[PDB]
Point group: C3
Chain length 289, copies 3
């Protein structure tokens, strides 16, 4: 069986003083199409393969191609994936929950380098023999994630730095906890990064959380992000503040809102300020199909 | 929801004295696939995104890729589109009605340069930050089209030439009228082009029309195209003559026929002669799927 | 109508002493998606167009694109195809029946160069004006195949070497015969290749066959491949031995097994030894969707 799904988004993206002779406000947009092939068996083992075709404004050649494939096998709550996998640091709950605006961005997300699903081809040639293996297990409320990524599987293993990651998250109705740890993140020796997060659903309508990170070799150093959101009917208000250890950095912060126009259609905007005083704002729509 | 549609065509394309050591007759073919994602809402606002994958004989690398995305939002007869848009000069009725043969070509089409939907990627890098905005409105019988195209939206607007176009068409059962005007067509300063056309359905079976163009900076100068077609059951006969102002040009003319083999299957051919005495002929089939 | 189908495969591929500083065992995988557009008519003539998108581990740029299109028209058992066609030497029955393992490979397959359906784009630019024409006819039990491939159809025909091929196969319940002949195979002057094969289904469960080849200009020379397979319920055992004329070559051989896990899911492995003593092994799964 083959299924197709995806989303489109478009809106205005403002970057204060973007560059000499550059427009500060542009129309930023993205089209993402996922092609998923699945083979179900009467034994209860499902086999699947996925490809993504993603276009973003500014992409080279004004064209769209598929990325590298991901393959998986699922049985009884357990999923093993191979190829272009999702990694543990990128898949754990809570770590991206401060994101806002129609481009789902936040200075409060981790300021470290690590491997993650590659949405597009890479013209440099760096991903040509990249291969990962990931294992996920969802007991019930609990999620366990493991990932191993070899950036160049054809070369002897001792000559290349491989990335190993582990993560887990747990949730009930009001509290959620998550933690992740990755060694040699991004294929960089000694870039060992870690995440610990917690969130409290202080009503059916609002949630407050705190994420803490060890950003490994990044110049940001350790980081803490405090965020919260509150839903008023169809509109959600979101905010966050984040601090990093880097000397002289400003406190980053963001305020935004989402409006659920209809099932699958979300109008969102945000105004944010970064660690170097960058001022960014956006307003747009995402529609799922 | 995602839908796929498209068409294939293949046949023989003859170009008299094509080139030293070149074959005059080749097998010319095209495959076009459209991927359209749409999100309908109970408020009556539809959101959509489209991608095209088009291959033509002779294409570089013997491969096929997607082009740049187009996004739209539709409500009550009004459609706003962003990204890789259809432009007013290219979307107005009547302007391409002299086309014939299985490759839908005519020397009687406008001999000017203007922006239009880009079916494929562009390896030169010229379309990488190209972004347009188009608005269409269909009252009933009346169609209004507006388009604005910025060839490089990231650079300050005063440093780049933007294209602005407007068009309208009107039809009843027997008469149709259309007009279009575009300033700085194709992003070329002072290339201001215009179109005025009219057609008369002088029976349920035949139609005669006249298109007039101001080709802006083109060397062709002003142009007039007289064309007509007549349907005899499943076969349609078409013809046209066209004249341009360029000094010494020949009168161009074409004669062709279409046969409706079945719903979605059309067999067509044509013999045409250009403004420089070029002699071209074709015969092939188009099938829609 | 548009349909999508395909398959994914992944497993372990071992090549003894693959190279200095290279891993002998890698995870080898492939994703193949076929996009087929078809237009059926009430006259009984079907028109179709197909595109393939195929990704393999190690592919340049870690991306996936479509190949060049194939078009066909079918009526009463007869199929005419144009563009990126299947050729007679590659489509005849029996010639690939010694293949084994999850990558469907065999040293017993013909060791000659010939044109065949091109699954992917070609970055060298060699296939840009490649165009073929193929005709197949299936009486009942009998299959006839004809193919003509011009590697560069835009250049005068006398300046380019074209490939011409013919093949036929015949089968009843127990015996099958096949033969193919191709002149100027692969667009190489005087590379004339030939195939004769026969197989005997010596039970409902087992089959033994013999393929003989004239490999044209290849250095392998003539070749003979003896193979057989036997099914025990859901598991099939396969083996082959092959000999070529090249001076000093070793006898190649292979042993493998397939397990039909479920409809559309096959687990397969093999251990093989080549003409130069290469030792290769694999084990993996293919799933169709
Ligand atoms: C095979 C799938 C298609 C992906 C191949 C695209 C190959 C493009 O690059 C060719 C080499 O030249 C380098 C191009 O510049 C960077 C392109 O990508 C970056 C922005 O999206
Ligand atoms: C041309 C530059 C402007 C483009 C930037 C768009 C910026 C728009 O505003 C950002 C969103 O800020 C609003 C959120 O806080 C209030 C939420 O309550 C409002 C409605 O639900
Ligand atoms: C990213 C989508 C795939 C589109 C990228 C193709 C990139 C090809 O070019 C790489 C740069 O080299 C120039 C190629 O020559 C012209 C190709 O296109 C023209 C005919 O269709
Ligand atoms: C090898 C070069 C020949 C390839 C060119 C094909 C040219 C074929 O003819 C063009 C079509 O001309 C015919 C139209 O006018 C008559 C219409 O009535 C006929 C059937 O409905
Ligand atoms: C137009 C469809 C996309 C196919 C175009 C890809 C173009 C890539 O090459 C650009 C020229 O540079 C040469 C690249 O190196 C070889 C790539 O392919 C080989 C392995 O799959
Ligand atoms: C790390 C290198 C190992 C990876 C190579 C996998 C090789 C595995 O074995 C190849 C298949 O050989 C077995 C076939 O013959 C016996 C068949 O009966 C067995 C079950 O149906």
């Amino acid at each position: 069986m083959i299924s197709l799904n995806g989303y489109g988004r478009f809106g205005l993206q403002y970057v204060e003083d973007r560059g000499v002779g550059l427009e500060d406000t542009i129309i930023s947009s993205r089209l993402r199409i996922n092609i998923v092939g699945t083979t179900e068996t009467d034994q209860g083992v499902t086999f699947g393969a996925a490809l993504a075709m993603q276009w973003d404004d500014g992409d080279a050649f004004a064209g769209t191609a598929g990325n590298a494939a991901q393959f998986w096998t699922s049985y009884n709550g357990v999923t093993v994936s191979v190829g272009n996998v999702d990694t543990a640091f990128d898949s754990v709950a809570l770590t991206y929950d401060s994101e806002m605006g129609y481009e789902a961005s936040s200075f409060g997300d981790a300021q470290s380098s690590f491997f993650a699903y590659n949405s597009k081809y890479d013209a440099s040639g760096a991903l040509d023999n990249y291969n990962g293996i990931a294992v996920t297990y969802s007991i019930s409320g609990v999620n366990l994630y493991l990932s191993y990524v070899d950036p160049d599987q054809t070369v002897d293993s001792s000559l290349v730095t491989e990335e190993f990651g582990i993560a887990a998250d747990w949730s009930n109705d009001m509290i959620s906890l998550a933690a992740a740890y990755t060694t040699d993140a991004g294929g960089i020796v000694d870039n060992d990064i870690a995440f610990v997060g917690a969130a409290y659903k202080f009503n059916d309508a609002g949630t407050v959380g705190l994420n803490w990170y060890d950003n490994g070799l990044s110049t940001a150093g350790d980081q803490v992000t405090l965020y919260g959101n509150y839903a008023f009917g169809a509109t959600t208000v979101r905010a966050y503040v984040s601090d990093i250890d880097r000397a002289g950095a400003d406190t980053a912060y963001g305020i935004g809102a989402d409006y659920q126009f209809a099932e699958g259609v979300k109008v969102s905007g945000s105004v944010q300020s970064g660690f170097a005083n960058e001022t960014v704002a956006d307003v747009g729509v995402r529609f799922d199909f």
